[PDB]
Chain length 315, copies 6
């Protein structure tokens, strides 16, 4: 069972909840504790009904009230939870591209880990939100091999119906070897080609065949053959195929490293995976680092922000 850590409130009443939120903001001070309680303990779909009831009740959109009443990471993390999932990811790409500089790790997290269908939903929410084509925007903010990998990812053209086939897999592994390790130069497009088109089951088989023909894993071959964005983007696909839980777990760890948090990263992953597989991600992070995700968050974030993240995630 793959599952998230956020469950719909039983005995849901959005009108009451929307009045509850009004109560916390109404007048001097903010009852953030009340805000955090409602947003964290209701599911996204319920949050969407709460948003509807607030606007109808008060003539102001809930997001705007929070933009005014909350600040910093707490603010952002509250607004993230209010986004419909697809919209949240679309806006995350928008911010990754059109802020100061390019957040290329964010683009990899989002575009190198999706199924065809997920990719297409995100493209449609992006068009909807900004009235522009997502691929057009990525090509204006990236270039070279990295750009091409992202363009491949955006077609949603993975042959997801391709069955596992050891013989062909061995053939692809040999072609990958030849394109990288087995030569002085590199045929990068062969790495792009295999990793973007083969079904996840068949890529798993390809990686197993690869380990048979070299003394390095595909992971090591790529790490050694490339650098910078294109290396990270190719690695992210391998990792998402072998263990997506670990991919996120690993990303979560790195976001929280040292005396400072990549708060965008932490918020995006916890929220976006909140109702899909954050339970397994929690399980995997434990095994991988011995420490609970929670304690990691608890000791990296402060105030209400920390309290909200803690409550979505779970112990």
């Amino acid at each position: 069972v793959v599952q998230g850590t956020v469950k719909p409130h039983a005995s849901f009443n959005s009108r009451e909840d929307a009045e509850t939120l009004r109560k916390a903001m109404k007048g001097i001070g903010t009852d953030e504790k009340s805000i955090t309680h409602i947003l964290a303990t209701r599911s996204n779909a319920q949050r969407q009904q709460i948003k509807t009831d607030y606007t109808t009740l008060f003539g102001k959109h809930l997001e705007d009230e929070l933009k005014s009443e909350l600040s910093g990471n707490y603010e952002a993390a509250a607004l993230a939870l209010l986004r419909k999932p697809d919209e949240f990811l679309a806006e995350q790409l928008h911010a990754a591209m059109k802020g100061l500089g390019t957040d290329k790790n964010a683009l990899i997290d989002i575009l190198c880990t999706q199924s065809n269908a997920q990719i297409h939903a995100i493209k449609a929410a992006f068009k909807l939100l900004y009235k522009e084509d997502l691929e057009k925007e990525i090509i204006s903010e990236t270039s070279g091999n990295f750009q091409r990998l992202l363009v491949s990812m955006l077609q949603g053209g993975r042959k997801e119906d391709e069955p596992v086939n050891a013989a062909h897999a061995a053939e692809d592994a040999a072609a990958i070897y030849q394109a990288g390790e087995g030569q002085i130069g590199t045929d990068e497009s062969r790495f792009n080609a295999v990793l973007a088109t083969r079904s996840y089951p068949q890529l798993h088989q390809i990686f197993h065949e690869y380990s048979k023909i070299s003394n390095k894993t595909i992971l090591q071959a790529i790490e050694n053959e490339f650098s910078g964005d294109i290396k990270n983007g190719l690695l992210a696909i391998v990792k998402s195929v072998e263990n997506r839980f670990a991919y996120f777990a690993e990303r979560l760890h790195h976001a929280m490293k040292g005396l400072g948090t990549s708060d965008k990263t932490l918020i995006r992953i916890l929220v976006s995976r909140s109702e899909i597989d954050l339970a397994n991600i929690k399980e995997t992070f434990q095994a991988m680092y011995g420490k609970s995700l929670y304690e990691f968050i608890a000791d990296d974030c402060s105030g209400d922000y920390k309290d909200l993240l803690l409550q979505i995630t779970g112990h």
Copy 2:
């Protein structure tokens, strides 16, 4: 029975009808009599087929031919009957906002008296027509408590399935009392919340419970508690709930009241209700005013304009 005064013409032939309209315009002179007769005795859906056929037969749109051949109120009323119904109100909203000044009675007649689905259809048609968000244009031409009521109306978020419940009605009646009569200042927000979200049947119940706890009616308190547009909008809601027929009946009277006519308002109600409840409105007007709606129109407008309105309205 609730119903309008315009019904589909039998033995309908859209092609013939388009050739008739052409005839009435080609060569020196304009046969307004024939143009009126076609427009007033063919239903909205039939008129759309006439427009398609006219354009296909002549390579010019009917609307553009009328815009050239007709003038003043007759032109507007003819054009108003050619519009699809959701389109008509979209353009009416548009014109109430982006012309000189803000026609707020128009906004109230249109946005305070609709059902959830009704509103949604209007917003959909507005987007279709102006490639803009009705809400965004609304917020640019209004402000304060009036804007917020309009925003609430535009959500289409009334809990239309809320059952009549005397107890809950009294909780709500008291809230509104304490927010208005019961204090020196006002909580308009509570008026907004209740009037926008409760279903019509429970609201009717609420005004009743209100009269049990106050010496004023809801009508009087609202009259006494506010001023201008915000007063008018909330009142418009209470009136639509108790008797939509009355409300429309009234605006008709006001439109034709004065030694001059609010021709804009007259065309809008006559046309937009023509296939829904204008008969009932007719039945009610006569009740409130003794004079029949037709006679009032026959007395207050002239020429082709009058004749068009008369034919749509019926005796």
Copy 3:
């Protein structure tokens, strides 16, 4: 001497005037008389600085305060005064085109009476206001000979430096005669050509010449040759040449004719001429109809609306 009736206020202090306007709207109640006083006794240029100081002081634009606190024809005339002149006419054209149906009398008044330079400023104000091209919107709301005349007008191609020449004027007079009276059918384009490109002084000479070679005046020939919109447009140009003062006067009268004021026509001409030739127009108004413009307005309009018009126009 040619001059308006509104004159710059002496010892002008925009910051003070904006404070007064605030005080008039702040709290329950609206002091329309102070608002009327500031608006009508300050020049348009001065109004622009008061709008500036009002937004800077209070973080809300003056027009938006007026859109909320004022209504009907008063709101409209007050807002009319706040617009810069090019903007006011560009918006008037917009409203004439984009409302329900077409206000072609509005198009002629504005488009058929201006100088090359006035049309250009209006075209530029329109684009700045709506992003769209004026000529392109006109072509979509009009057709046939009338559309072409307004397109001619939109070029600002009149030969304003063509000097009075009797010989050439007689030739123009002859082609126009042959164009209409001289034949069974018409050469409407010849009417368009001469009336659009000749200078006003030369056109005056051409009309003098026409009445010599014909038993009809150019006015009567046009009346006789054409109908509807294109007839009124060509008529308007002849009247604007002979006496612009009489043209607006007539429009004013007509606007106030019978039992109903075309209030936008009235508002439009009182506002847009207010600082140009409103003085000469009132003079001519008296001459043609025995009553002062003032008395006609005061007898035809009411309340705050009436006060404002009266105060901008003066006795």
Copy 4:
């Protein structure tokens, strides 16, 4: 049976075909013979699958590869085959309008020969491609009777389910006679009216009736009465009714006659009809011209362009 000359390839593998295309382009030289082979022997739907897989394997769109690697008519023909059929005709429309002059016969080829459904699909594609309205663009690049025929065509309003009826047909056959032959002037609008609105089977009946009340066929009648753009537009409607295959054969013949080749017309007809009726068109050509379409093309084209076109067409 009516059918095209291009059929889906047996044992289709779009990943292999995409790899084949890349091989033909990568490195030194370009293997046009292999490009032609893949394009000409796979169906349009297959080519779409090949496009998706090329972009997914390599991170670059196939069209862009060809835009760089190919040149002249060969590039245009190859790109044409890659377009979805509706997009192809939409783009063909654009290029007929938005280039230097106006390719009016192209506009006739495309808008006067389609069914209602086909017209609606081309319109939607155009709006998809360009974010503009086809009608709106057509009205900006054409005028007069010619424009109106194209506007008629663009409504997709033909009464396609109109049953044959000798009596009503004769009425139209007489009306059309009077609009042209039975006088010195012409009533063009009647030719427009009947030619755009009646079902193809009923028009065919009307052409029959026409011959019974005239000396000249409707073709001859139309030739005589009209000239230029509108004459060819009306003639194209009569031809599409009487012998659609004959029309294209004629156009094809026309493209290749003289001292050159109208290659854009040649490519547009062969490609757009390749999976529709190029077979029957090929037959009719030989019937009318005694020489095969293949031979004519072999005679008139050269290089990979010729090769490509010959392969599409078939002996």
Copy 5:
């Protein structure tokens, strides 16, 4: 003397600097140390010529090369230096609004601290950059009093030529006393009006006059009367009037506060001020915290990011 820390490089050769940058990026590896040196030791005006030459030499824009070759805060800071100063602030604004949530402190740093001329340059750059109106976006991402103060700032309508005058200053200060301290409720608007319209010197006087009538300073008074965004915005204007250098000092300090670093904030101020008053800000910072800005950045930043920041700043 007030001045920045970056000066034009002597014997400048943009063609050469562009080749230098090319050389640092081509092939295996990246010479970040050479990129840092060109960017930090050439002035913004020199950097613009370097961009022009890079693009002309190589057919790729410098910004795009760094978006690929660089990452994280180093990428951001390098890209920030390449932006023209007006464009930099505008895109800084865009990012404060259109990411996830609102960077309210960024809005205040940029919008409540400029001269009228500076504010108009920023808006013009934004319009050029985003093809949208700055104020429009602002009203969408902020609300209430904080929104109103920002709309005030955007007008650029401060009366900068208002002379210092004790009497008018005592008035303002007394009016300010009554709107906060003096009364139970608050008249926020009075604070908004005085702080937005008064010249900085008159504001200085007005703050003295407040000290004459209250035991609270203007800061204590505002701290006492408000909270959240509007409090911070009003405090910022006072601080900007009293000592602009100390405001940046305090904001830099706070950016590097925690364990920590608001890098977005740190980058914006050092870059935005690098050529204006950073030297004085450097002086002031030493004074306020007894440690140099330099050693502060050094201990708070790492790698090539800190290297660039240290070089821009200087010891």
Copy 6:
């Protein structure tokens, strides 16, 4: 002396000229002979005043008349003559890109042969006409090294005032030798860099230096190093430096070669240069081919089309 072949008509009267054009199109048929005469013997600036007067006179644009009244190459050339010169080129680019496929030779003719001033005016005209960025459209329809060359050309960044420097010229010729002839592979970026940024006189000196270190000329090295579009682009630059007249002569000759005519290229070069250097181009053409340009056009074209080309060119 460098000059065109079209000179302003003596005793110019645009009103009369417009009347001449109307007459040649009104009624039975068209006087193509009179239209050719006005277009061919008036200058562009005079044509612009003629256009303005026709539209003012008649309320339709001259371009729109010719689009209906003229066809084929004849329509195209007249319309070309009517365009303002910067507009004409922007539209040549547009058509080269947004028709079926890409006309790469036209992009080279236009973008590889201009001064910085000339390119900036073309971009500005393109942005005007299409509300788009020319560089963005270019990158959409080109790729690889050819795209990069076009992007360089679009910066308008040539150091046109670079003094001839023999030491630098020898350096530049040695780096180009090492980037091509000198090694097995190629450093395309170095050809790009030198050919786009150096002044024409310095390039001339560089080409001379090349022949001191190589057995090939620079033309030969490029021919042997590259193929396809990039080769042609680099060659056009070299040819433009050495003798632009010849480049144009050479393209003209190519366009008139074969058993047809690239009328696109012929019209573009004759029109675009008619008032710049077509006289000098005619000489050089004579010198290179032995036959005059006039007789070549005469041999290759027909009808009014040939007539107009011939009259523009002159003997």
